[PDB]
Write a protein that binds this ligand. Structure first.
Ligand SMILES: NCCc1c[nH]cn1
Ligand SMILES: NCCc1c[nH]cn1
Length: 175
């Protein structure tokens, strides 16, 4: 059993996990929307999630990712570092998933449902002690690409979508 969009022949061209992970090195990615409220690491009613990477390791298809996030337990922005590795899921031959590993050794494996140059639609299977659902990540939290947004809305149909990282996360400007 696997999601109907998890068809490598049909959709693999837009499910390149390693390319998507390496993209975190040049630009910060913001999780702009999701269909679930709680994450074991980011917290409850989490918002303002962003990520940037460094230390690309081609041999391992891994990066060291630095995250920022907020939740209802603290008014201040929170930060964490996790290793993320491009791995295979759903029988794919080319890596289509992200294996996150926290400093405490906790592992989460999420799957790229759709990805374009500056945005990703990610599926959380819900088997890592977490809620099953979808996430939408983009490099510009104010200008969301239509292709990814449409794919996110298509795959996430029947759920409750909510904003995660928005301009409300920051107090921009001066005086
Ligand atoms: N471009 C990939 C965005 C992301 C989500 N999780 C880790 N990185
Ligand atoms: N779906 C996000 C799981 C995760 C990875 N790191 C922290 N939380």
């Amino acid at each position: 059993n696997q999601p109907d969009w998890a068809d490598e022949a049909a959709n693999g061209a837009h499910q390149d996990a390693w390319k998507s992970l390496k993209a975190d090195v040049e630009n910060v990615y913001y999780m702009v929307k999701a269909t679930y409220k709680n994450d074991p690491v980011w917290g409850n009613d989490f918002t303002c999630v962003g990520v940037m990477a460094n230390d690309v390791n081609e041999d391992e298809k891994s990066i060291q990712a630095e995250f920022l996030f907020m939740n209802n337990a603290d008014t201040n922005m929170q930060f964490a570092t996790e290793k993320v590795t491009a791995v295979k899921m759903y029988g794919y031959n080319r890596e289509n998933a992200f294996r996150y590993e926290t400093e405490d050794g906790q592992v989460f494996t999420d799957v790229i449902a759709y990805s374009d140059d500056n945005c990703d639609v990610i599926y959380v299977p819900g088997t890592d002690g977490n809620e099953e659902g979808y996430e939408l990540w983009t490099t510009d939290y104010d200008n969301i690409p239509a292709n990814c947004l449409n794919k996110f809305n298509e795959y996430a149909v029947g759920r409750e979508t909510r904003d995660v990282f928005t301009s409300a996360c920051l107090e921009i400007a001066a005086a």
